[PDB]
């Protein structure tokens, strides 16, 4: 019965998922002066040109745009990663007003929303096998700030009315996730977890420094589905956040 409310929200999750109090939980606050520049980190390779979106699902906690991951189409490689990770889905976290919504924070600053592009390591059989492994997933995190509209988000926003109800899905083919990426691929990276139950510690996080801008109208349409589906920042503990820059 986990969710984001007073009675079932993040502070309760540890009861059903004790790893919630574990050693590599996400999200975290990215303290830009404690983040360590690592010259050995390679540039990120985001290869999304042959992405095949299939559908969009309201899973009760967010909406997921799902991709065909049955062969290498949209993949993430390079950066802190060893090998190739296939895009399986993306989703967002957002708030009930503009001053909150992101999961990661940067020097304690919260953005209005955060996009997670979820990828699994093709050394493993499928996503299900990958989440059982400490290097199973790579999640590309992108902050959303409110200002100008992101044109490449409009197709997502426009279909949401058709999946207002929990559990419903819709066909969602031929969406190009390249339209959700900022100019720069400068990033921070650290080992962490899924930010929703079961909170498995299987993720290499790659959080981009440059946010994308979305319009007030765009985020307001997210909110017609639910609000405040973000887990707050968890302690960094015995980890270091590394930066691809400065
Ligand atoms: Zn997420």
Curated annotation (Swiss-Prot):
<feature type="site" description="Involved in the binding of some activators, including histamine and L-histidine">
    <location>
        <position position="89"/>
    </location>
</feature>
<dbReference type="GO" id="GO:0002009">
    <property type="term" value="P:morphogenesis of an epithelium"/>
</dbReference>
<keyword id="KW-0225">Disease variant</keyword>
<comment type="function">
    <text>Catalyzes the reversible hydration of carbon dioxide. Can also hydrate cyanamide to urea. Stimulates the chloride-bicarbonate exchange activity of SLC26A6. Essential for bone resorption and osteoclast differentiation. Involved in the regulation of fluid secretion into the anterior chamber of the eye. Contributes to intracellular pH regulation in the duodenal upper villous epithelium during proton-coupled peptide absorption.</text>
</comment>
<feature type="site" description="Fine-tunes the proton-transfer properties of H-64; involved in the binding of some activators, including histamine and L-histidine">
    <location>
        <position position="64"/>
    </location>
</feature>
<dbReference type="GO" id="GO:0005829">
    <property type="term" value="C:cytosol"/>
</dbReference>
<dbReference type="GO" id="GO:0005737">
    <property type="term" value="C:cytoplasm"/>
</dbReference>
<dbReference type="GO" id="GO:0015670">
    <property type="term" value="P:carbon dioxide transport"/>
</dbReference>
<dbReference type="GO" id="GO:0070050">
    <property type="term" value="P:neuron cellular homeostasis"/>
</dbReference>
<feature type="site" description="Fine-tunes the proton-transfer properties of H-64; involved in the binding of some activators, including histamine and L-histidine">
    <location>
        <position position="59"/>
    </location>
</feature>
<feature type="modified residue" description="Phosphoserine">
    <location>
        <position position="169"/>
    </location>
</feature>
<feature type="binding site">
    <location>
        <position position="93"/>
    </location>
    <ligand>
        <name>Zn(2+)</name>
    </ligand>
</feature>
<keyword id="KW-0472">Membrane</keyword>
<dbReference type="GO" id="GO:0032230">
    <property type="term" value="P:positive regulation of synaptic transmission, GABAergic"/>
</dbReference>
<dbReference type="InterPro" id="IPR018338">
    <property type="entry name" value="Carbonic_anhydrase_a-class_CS"/>
</dbReference>
<keyword id="KW-0456">Lyase</keyword>
<feature type="domain" description="Alpha-carbonic anhydrase">
    <location>
        <begin position="1"/>
        <end position="245"/>
    </location>
</feature>
<keyword id="KW-0987">Osteopetrosis</keyword>
<dbReference type="GO" id="GO:0043209">
    <property type="term" value="C:myelin sheath"/>
</dbReference>
<dbReference type="GO" id="GO:0004064">
    <property type="term" value="F:arylesterase activity"/>
</dbReference>
<keyword id="KW-0007">Acetylation</keyword>
<dbReference type="GO" id="GO:2001150">
    <property type="term" value="P:positive regulation of dipeptide transmembrane transport"/>
</dbReference>
<keyword id="KW-0479">Metal-binding</keyword>
<feature type="binding site">
    <location>
        <begin position="195"/>
        <end position="196"/>
    </location>
    <ligand>
        <name>substrate</name>
    </ligand>
</feature>
<dbReference type="Pfam" id="PF00194">
    <property type="entry name" value="Carb_anhydrase"/>
</dbReference>
<dbReference type="InterPro" id="IPR001148">
    <property type="entry name" value="CA_dom"/>
</dbReference>
<dbReference type="GO" id="GO:0004089">
    <property type="term" value="F:carbonate dehydratase activity"/>
</dbReference>
<keyword id="KW-0597">Phosphoprotein</keyword>
<keyword id="KW-1003">Cell membrane</keyword>
<dbReference type="GO" id="GO:0046903">
    <property type="term" value="P:secretion"/>
</dbReference>
<keyword id="KW-0862">Zinc</keyword>
<dbReference type="GO" id="GO:0045177">
    <property type="term" value="C:apical part of cell"/>
</dbReference>
<feature type="modified residue" description="Phosphoserine">
    <location>
        <position position="162"/>
    </location>
</feature>
<dbReference type="GO" id="GO:0044070">
    <property type="term" value="P:regulation of monoatomic anion transport"/>
</dbReference>
<feature type="active site" description="Proton donor/acceptor">
    <location>
        <position position="61"/>
    </location>
</feature>
<dbReference type="GO" id="GO:0005886">
    <property type="term" value="C:plasma membrane"/>
</dbReference>
<dbReference type="GO" id="GO:0038166">
    <property type="term" value="P:angiotensin-activated signaling pathway"/>
</dbReference>
<feature type="binding site">
    <location>
        <position position="91"/>
    </location>
    <ligand>
        <name>Zn(2+)</name>
    </ligand>
</feature>
<dbReference type="GO" id="GO:0008270">
    <property type="term" value="F:zinc ion binding"/>
</dbReference>
<dbReference type="GO" id="GO:0051453">
    <property type="term" value="P:regulation of intracellular pH"/>
</dbReference>
<feature type="binding site">
    <location>
        <position position="116"/>
    </location>
    <ligand>
        <name>Zn(2+)</name>
    </ligand>
</feature>
<dbReference type="GO" id="GO:0018820">
    <property type="term" value="F:cyanamide hydratase activity"/>
</dbReference>
């Amino acid at each position: 019965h986990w969710g984001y409310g007073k009675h079932n929200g993040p502070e309760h999750w540890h009861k059903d998922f004790p790893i919630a109090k574990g050693e590599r939980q996400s999200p975290v606050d990215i303290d830009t002066h404690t983040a360590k520049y690592d010259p050995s980190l390679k540039p990120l390779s985001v290869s999304y040109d042959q992405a095949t979106s299939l559908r969009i699902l309201n899973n009760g906690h967010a909406f997921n745009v799902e991709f065909d991951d049955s062969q290498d189409k949209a993949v993430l490689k390079g950066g802190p990663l060893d090998g190739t990770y296939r895009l399986i889905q993306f989703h967002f976290h957002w708030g009930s007003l503009d001053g909150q919504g992101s999961e990661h924070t940067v020097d304690k600053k919260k953005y209005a929303a955060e996009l997670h592009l979820v990828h699994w390591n093709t050394k493993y059989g499928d996503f299900g096998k990958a989440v059982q492994q400490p290097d199973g997933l790579a999640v590309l995190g992108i902050f959303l700030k409110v200002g100008s509209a992101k044109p490449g988000l409009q197709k997502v926003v426009d279909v949401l009315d058709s999946i207002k109800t929990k559990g419903k899905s819709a066909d969602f083919t031929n969406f190009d996730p390249r339209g959700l990426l900022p100019e720069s691929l400068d990033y921070w990276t650290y080992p962490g977890s899924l930010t929703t139950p079961p909170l498995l510690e299987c993720v290499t996080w790659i959080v981009l420094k440059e946010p994308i801008s979305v319009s007030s109208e765009q985020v307001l349409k997210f909110r017609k589905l639910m609000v405040d589906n973000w887990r707050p920042a968890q302690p960094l503990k015995n980890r270091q956040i590394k930066a691809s820059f400065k």
